[PDB]
Structure formats: C-alpha cells, structure tokens
Design a protein around this ligand. Structure first.
Ligand SMILES: COc1cc(F)c(C(=O)c2ccnc(Nc3ccc(C#N)cc3)n2)c(F)c1
Lengths: 536, 401
C-alpha cells in the first residue's frame, strides 16, 4: 500500500536545479531486469510513466541468489536536495528503559515505498530505463513514494510514522512504542493475552494507514545490545585467543572492551591502548608489553561470567559510585539497589598537561552527571572516594568554579588526596632562592640557576631548551639544593601557574620531578615577581 | 501585518544542538508549549525544517517560564535589528538615581512573525533517553529573546509610552530585548508610584527589579595599608603596580623597585623610604580616577572577565581591548556556580544600562559544568555570549580589596 497520509513538502536547495545525469548504457539483461521491476512497481503505484516534458534524470542500474535489485543512484539529486531535521539526535540507553511485562517487535514491510512523496517534487526523481544499445527513447518513470537512497526518506518516513502513531499513543498511554528505522518495538505491562490483543489493534491501526506488519520474540539484538523485558546486556563479546596481535586486532579488541565496559565493571584498556600509540600499519604485529598482557588477563577474568544490567525504576534514587583504578583511570557503577547495576562505565581522558586526582575525580563526576540527565532526566547521588574536607579544601582555594551534586564519602581505596600543599606565607628561617631561567631563541642554549639570601649561588647550562623549560629547571634546581623548607622567587607566571594548581601527575618529566621534590618538602612558599624589574 | 525579515547575506538559519534537559524541565516545557500552541503562538513542524535553536526552563517565584536561546539567530539576523531597526541607547539612563526593570516580553506575542522567517525560529523539546523523537515547533508571532522582536515592535512601543513620556519628561525609558528600563531621579516613593502608573499604560495594551546606577562607583585597585613591609609585601606591591601601569597612564614603580634590590630574605622587614611612600601614595591617587584614554567604541564588542577571589566574592573587568578597562567591580555572597551565574547577570544588567550592549564573558569554569547548572539559577530573559577560560591567578590577587 501507499499511506493515505499527508505529504511532507520538499524543495531543492536555494539556487539549485533538479539533476540531469545522462543514463549510461546497460547490458540487455540489466535492461530486462529493470523493466520487469518497474512494471511491478508501476502496478502498485510506486512509480509513474512520464512524458518527454520532464527534463530531469538520474542514472538507474541493476545488480544480482538470482534475484535482481534496482539501484537508483541519487548522488546528484541528494546534493541538490534541502537539508532535513535529523532522524535521531540520540539513541536510547537500555539502562534508561523501564522494566516491562511483554515486548514485541513489528517490522514495517516496504517502509519507504509505503509513504507518498510530495507531488511537487516527484518530477526530480525521474529516471530512464535505456533501450538496447541505447538506440531508441528510454522508458521514463518518476517516483510517487519515498525512494531508496534519497536524502529525505529516513526523515519523512519517521515523521510519517510518528504522525500516524499519535492517535494510538494518545489512546494508549500505558504502552510504550519505540520507532527505530523501520522497526517498532512495543512494550507494556499487560499479561500476554491482553498484550497480543493490544498488538493486534496497533497492527489494524497501522493497516488503515498503509503500513503492513508481521513476530520475533526476545532477546532482541539491537544496537549491539541484547534486550530482554527484565534485563539488558551487551551483544556477546568474544575475545580472540591468538599468538600474534596486529594493530587491527588490537583496535578491534579495544573497541569490544570499550563497548563491554557499559555493563562489565572495571574493564581497563590503558595498557592495550598504549600499544596503539605511534604511526602504525594495520597489518603490523605488536608484541604485548607485560602490563598490556596483565590488562588482557584481568579483562579476560572480568568477561568470563555473563553480566546483565537491570532496568530503571523512576520511583527510586540513582546512586553513582566512582573508584580510582590508577594512572588517570576511573571506573564507575550506577545502581538503585546495591549492587544491581543499571550500568557501569569508565573515564580516563587527560584534560590538560597537568592535573591532580581531585580535578580528575571532579571531571569524572561531571561526565557522569551529564550522562545521567540524558538517560534518566535527573542527576544521581554520588559516593566518592574522597573526604569532604579534602574536597572543600581544594575547591575553595582553586580559582576555577565548581559544583557537583549531592555526594558523600565512601571508603574505597585508593582515596583521593592532595599530596602536597603550598604555604600561604613566606617561611621564616628558611632559605629564599631567587631562581631564574632563560633560553637563547637563536641557539637553544639555556642557563638555569639561583641566588639565595645566604649567598648560595649556582648556574647550570641546558641544551635544546626553551624559556618555559629553563624556568621549570630553575625551580627544580632550587628544590634539589634546598632543605625541607624553602621560599622560591621566580618571574615565571608559567611555572607558577602550573605549580599552584597542585599537580600530582603530568606529561612533562620536569614537572613530575618537581612534583617529586614538592611532596618531599615540609614547607614551600612560591612567589612571583615581574621580570626585568631588577627584583633580586 | 508582518514586517519582512531577511537573514544576513548568504547565510543560513541556526542549527544549534539542544542541551540535555532534566525531566522536571522537559515537563514544564511540554505544559507551556501545549498552551502556546492552543493559543496559536507556535505550531508543530515537520522534518522539512532543518533549523533548531536551544530551549530551557527557568523560574525567574515557582512559575516555570520558557527561555529560548536565540544567541545564534540574533548573530545571523544582526543587520535587521541593529542597522535597519536599531533601538537607540540613552546615555542619561546610567545617570538616574533609580532604574527599574520591567518585563514586557508579553507584548510581542500579539504580533505575527513574517510568514517566511518563521522556519528560522524552530526549537525542539527533547525526550528523556531519546525514547520518543523531539517535539518540534516554530513561532507564529514575535518570539521572546530574539533581538528582532523589540526592533519590530519599536513602532508600537513608542505609541504606548508616548502619553507617559510627555507627562514625565525627566523619565528615561529604554528598551532592551524583552525588558523596559525606567530611570528617574525621584524620591524612591515617588519613583515607585511612577512605575505603577507606567504599568497601567502597559496594562491597557496587553503588557501585564530596582537599580541605583549613581551609586555604581568603580572598584579602584587598592594598595595595602601598612606600616610594616616585608620583602614579600613589597614584591607583591610591585607586582600589583607593574600590572596597573598597563592600564593607568603615569603609574610609576621605580622608587619602589629601589628597595627591592639585593637578594633579601622574603620575611625581611624593610623601611619605607621617603620617595617610596611618595611614589606609592601618588599611584594611590591615580588609581582612584578613571583610566585616561579609554573610551567605549560602539562598533566594538564588550568583553567581561571574571575571577573567583574566595569566600563568595568575585572581581570583574569590562573592556573592549585588553587592559583598557571600561569598568571594574566586585560581587557579594553557597555554591560557586550559583554565585558565578548571579555575578554574570548583575554584570550584564549594568552593561545594558551603561552601553545598551551585553558583554562576551570569559568564565572560569569547565564548560560542561556551567552548561549543566547555569539554568538552575538563571533569572534573566536574555543570555549573554560566553566562553570558558583558565584564569591567571596573578590577575586575581591584583584585584583583592
Ligand atoms: C530498542 O528497543 C526499545 C524498546 C522500547 F520500548 C524503548 C522505549 O521507548 C521504552 C520506554 C520505556 N520503557 C521501555 N522498556 C523496555 C523496552 C524493551 C525491552 C525489551 N526487550 C525491555 C524494556 N522502553 C526503547 F527506547 C528501545
């Protein structure tokens, strides 16, 4: 059938005219196939024979079981067609779904061909079955329905389907219908009997609108998930056992672990991912480092027992728990009743060159907060491995604003803590180092040194360096040579910036070494002075 | 009747992503939009409209109110509302003792939007977990938040205010987006009475917050009051003066870098030499006046920088070219994001009153954090431009009070 629904109006891009691609010549069998197909389509009203008045064309062809298919190549019409709203701005997450008694999938048969095209547009869909060796006038058709491979078809179909479902939805609030391409997933809390009845009424309603439909039973494979009516999990994950790992094997392995990490707690991929780093051939063999091999083993153990997630009960709070796995790796679980996870996840991204665990935890929390609002429309209650005192110490002193929803301390080591503090005031009875660092732009040479109030003085030389590096070196110098307590005067806003953020991890080894020092100290006061103003 | 609205040359309408909303606000927006559709202000639309501007709910007091983020549409229509129909800004507004802010957004909803512009005002009500495709609408009437609306309504607004303006010649009434700013020098009592009279005029036409600009006086950068000066204290002094001289013509620092020579212990106490406390005191007096040589340029964008001080106080500067400060200030007392949000609204309000323009904000906060939370505390009908920045903590210790 062809839905009795209103059509969606459609226009070419401003300025643009309909396509006019010349039909290439087809072999006789291809020509024969298309003629039979277009005759059948014509009979059902899918297409219409058209006159020589219609100046637009798009190349059609035919491909090979010994069934033939008509491929209309819409490259040109597509790039001359208007933009449409996006079909889906997002995909539901199973963890967001509410538990259901019974669930049914109906697939719409011949979806696009069952929806009418805007009459004012059909002309641009004109195509031409060539004659043998292209000697006579082709046979010319235009579409009456949504063409396969045309730009506007996914959207107009989905809109048409939505428009159609609206009545049934309104007359059936307690029923859940999810539109995905040309499937409908239908869920309810009815007992099977009244359910299969509601399902028949839905069909009958679809039929009155030009949409035929079957029936598959659970579990449903969809978007890499496996959906049951009371639990969900990811598609079956099989980790290859092999002696040699190519870049492409490792990529696919990281992809499967990342996907599995939605519901299998504590999946790790840092060490696997380190292998990928570098310029590297798809086919190139990468021997697994020991840590990578340890990672593979742990995930291997994690993945043995099948794990499923529960569905969402909107009458209950969401609890989100985060744990540090180390090396900037964080893992989390989200449950409403301990410990029946709706979902799990991980966070590992480095934001900046230098951070500490408090900053990282806060980012993890932020990522989880956003994700919860999408999936459940509310934020979770957090259980974090950090003392309230630690956290409020840091974020009141820090210059960035922050705010994380309701949370509370949970004792799950490693705990997150600041590993040093910088003094608020000059320290009395400790050496003041006036440090200084600089690099000749022309030669890469650099001197880094200091002068103290106790007459100590030292100057090293560095090679292939930069002002930034030499200023860090000078601060590092003063930390090595000084006692457990020390004041340090630098003109580098740059080094000052980095160190005042109490980094505990960094991409620069200099900065890691400086971090070594700072943790070892008992008191450090850092002061900045304007450069060249002849201060000390 | 409808006024012809055409976008910028060769530029398309907005296509801005809807930031995720919580369930309570999605609900509020459905409630609100079902009513406006019923009343014909907006209509459902089909997939053949590719445009989309963000929408959110605020409270502004437990009535949910719909806030459309037209920042992109405004950029792309700026010829229309700035040049073809620009509302002039009165310089006397900032001079009144009392400026009252009245919301007149309800006015626009009685005027039809040019049939051919409507598609550019499309917005989406998304669903939780994307279980059901977003609810899509476009406007049929001048929408709140689009700078086009007051530009178009300008003709009717002056008809409405004509009687009241004639009868009170010393009241300045200025319109910026959905609000009226009304300024007088009256006693606060008489001022309030006059606002009430103004409501009645508005009330007859379908149009059913108190500032004191005079008191607005710059926060002068401030130099420590002491008798005892360590090396550290003077170091911090030179640092704060050094930076000030970037802005203030005639800031001198040498008689102080005088005492700061030699590698002396940080804690060491140092006598304030004669010249030193002289050069110092002279700088104090310069720091009290406005910057010589800095002038608002109407063609240039305003920038606002904010720093978290501590303890619930924030400093800010408004400029067009870095270090050429047009204004500096502070803000009072909970939650970091709440306070930032409040400070941004105060600064924007002052900015509108002074220049008839809102600043682009450099905000010291992680993007997703601002994004997640700002509408929990947003009260205004407009939204300034903003961006997210990593504050030099030296910049901030120069602005303590
Ligand atoms: C992609 O399949 C679907 C099927 C659906 F209905 C939806 C829903 O819109 C939806 C809404 C509320 N509860 C459930 N609960 C629910 C649905 C299906 C099963 C199963 N099996 C279990 C629970 N699903 C969806 F977003 C995706």
């Amino acid at each position: 059938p062809i839905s009795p629904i209103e059509t969606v109006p459609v226009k070419l891009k401003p300025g643009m005219d309909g396509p006019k691609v010349k039909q290439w010549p087809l072999t006789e069998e291809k020509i024969k196939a298309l003629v039979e197909i277009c005759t059948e389509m014509e009979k059902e009203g899918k297409i219409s024979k058209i006159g020589p008045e219609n100046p637009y064309n798009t190349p059609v062809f035919a491909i090979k079981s010994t069934k033939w298919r008509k491929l209309v190549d819409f490259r040109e019409l597509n790039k001359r067609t208007q933009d449409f709203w996006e079909v889906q701005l997002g995909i539901p997450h199973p963890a967001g779904l509410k538990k259901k008694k019974s669930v049914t999938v109906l697939d719409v048969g011949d979806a696009y061909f069952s929806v009418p095209l805007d009459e004012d547009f059909r002309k641009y869909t004109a195509f031409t079955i060539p004659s043998i060796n292209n000697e006579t006038p082709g046979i010319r058709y235009q579409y009456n329905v949504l063409p396969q491979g045309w730009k506007g078809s996914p959207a107009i179909f989905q809109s048409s389907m939505t428009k159609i479902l609206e009545p049934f939805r309104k007359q059936n609030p307690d029923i859940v219908i999810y539109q995905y391409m040309d499937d409908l997933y239908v869920g309810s809390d009815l007992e099977i009997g009244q359910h299969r009845t509601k399902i028949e009424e839905l069909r009958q309603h679809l039929l009155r609108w030009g949409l035929t439909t079957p029936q598959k039973e659970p579990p449903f494979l969809w978007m890499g998930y496996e959906l049951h009516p009371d639990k969900w999990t990811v598609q079956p994950i099989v980790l290859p056992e092999k002696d040699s790992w190519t870049v492409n094997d490792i990529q696919k392995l990281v992809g499967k672990l990342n996907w599995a990490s939605q519901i299998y707690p504590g999946i790790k991929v840092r060490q696997l991912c380190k292998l990928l780093r570098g310029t590297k051939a798809l086919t190139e063999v990468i021997p697994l480092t020991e840590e990578a091999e340890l990672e593979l083993a742990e995930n291997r153990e994690i993945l043995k027992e099948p794990v499923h997630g529960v569905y969402y009960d909107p009458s209950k709070d969401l609890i989100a728990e985060i744990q540090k796995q180390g090396q900037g790796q964080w893992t989390y679980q989200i449950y409403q009743e301990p410990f029946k996870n709706l979902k799990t996840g991980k966070y590992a991204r480095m934001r900046g060159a230098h951070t500490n665990d408090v900053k990282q935890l806060t980012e993890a929390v932020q990522k989880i907060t956003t994700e919860s609002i999408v999936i459940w429309g509310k934020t979770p209650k957090f259980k974090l491995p950090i003392q309230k005192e630690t956290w409020e110490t840091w974020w009141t002193e820090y210059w960035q604003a922050t705010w994380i929803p309701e949370w509370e301390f949970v004792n799950t080591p490693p705990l997150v803590k600041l590993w040093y503090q910088l003094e608020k005031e000059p320290i009395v009875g400790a050496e003041t180092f006036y440090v200084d660092g600089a690099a000749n732009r022309e030669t890469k040479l650099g001197k880094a040194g200091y002068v103290t109030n106790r007459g100590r003085q030292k100057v090293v030389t560095l090679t292939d360096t930069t002002n930034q590096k030499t200023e860090l070196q000078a601060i590092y110098l003063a930390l090595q040579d000084s006692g457990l307590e020390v004041n340090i005067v630098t003109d580098s806003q740059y080094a000052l910036g980095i160190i005042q953020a109490q980094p505990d991890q960094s991409e620069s080894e200099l900065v890691n070494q400086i971090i070594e020092q700072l943790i070892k100290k008992e008191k450090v006061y850092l002061a900045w002075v304007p450069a060249h103003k002849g201060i000390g | 009747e409808t006024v012809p609205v055409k976008l910028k040359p060769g530029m398309d309408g907005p296509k801005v992503k809807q930031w995720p909303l919580t369930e309570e606000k999605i609900k509020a927006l459905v409630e609100i939009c079902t009513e406006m559709e019923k009343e014909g202000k907006i209509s459902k639309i089909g997939p053949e409209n590719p445009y989309n501007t963000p929408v959110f709910a605020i409270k502004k007091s437990t009535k949910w109110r719909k806030l459309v983020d037209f920042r992109e549409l405004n950029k792309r229509t700026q010829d229309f509302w700035e040049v073809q129909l620009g509302i002039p800004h009165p310089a006397g507004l900032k001079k009144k003792k009392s400026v009252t802010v009245l919301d007149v957004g309800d006015a626009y909803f009685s005027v039809p939007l040019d049939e051919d512009f409507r598609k550019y005002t499309a917005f989406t009500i998304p669903s939780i977990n994307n279980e059901t495709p977003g609810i899509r609408y476009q406007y049929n009437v001048l929408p709140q938040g689009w700078k086009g609306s007051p530009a178009i309504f300008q003709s009717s607004m002056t008809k409405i205010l004509e009687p009241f303006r004639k009868q009170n010649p010393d009241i300045v009434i200025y319109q910026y987006m959905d609000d009226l700013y009304v300024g007088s020098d009256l006693e606060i009592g008489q001022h309030r009475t006059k606002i009430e009279e103004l409501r009645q005029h508005l009330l007859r036409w379908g149009l059913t917050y108190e500032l004191h600009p005079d008191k607005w006086t710059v926060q002068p950068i401030v130099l420590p009051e002491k008798d005892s000066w360590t090396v550290n204290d003077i170091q911090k002094l030179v640092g704060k003066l050094n930076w000030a001289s970037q802005i203030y013509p005639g800031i001198k620092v040498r008689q102080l870098c005088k005492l700061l020579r030699g590698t002396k212990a940080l804690t060491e106490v140092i006598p304030l030499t004669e010249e030193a406390e002289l050069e110092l005191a002279e700088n104090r007096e310069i720091l009290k006046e406005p910057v010589h040589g800095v002038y608002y340029d109407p063609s240039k964008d305003l920038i606002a920088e904010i720093q978290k001080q501590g303890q619930g106080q924030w400093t800010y500067q408004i400029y067009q070219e870095p270090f050429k400060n047009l204004k500096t200030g502070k803000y009072a007392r909970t939650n970091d994001v709440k306070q930032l949000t409040e400070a941004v609204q105060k600064i924007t309000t002052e900015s509108i009153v002074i220049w008839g323009k809102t600043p682009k904000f450099k905000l010291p906060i992680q993007k997703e954090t601002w994004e997640t939370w700002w509408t929990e505390y947003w009260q205004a009908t407009w939204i300034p431009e903003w961006e997210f920045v990593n504050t030099p903590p030296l910049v901030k210790l120069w602005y303590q009070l």
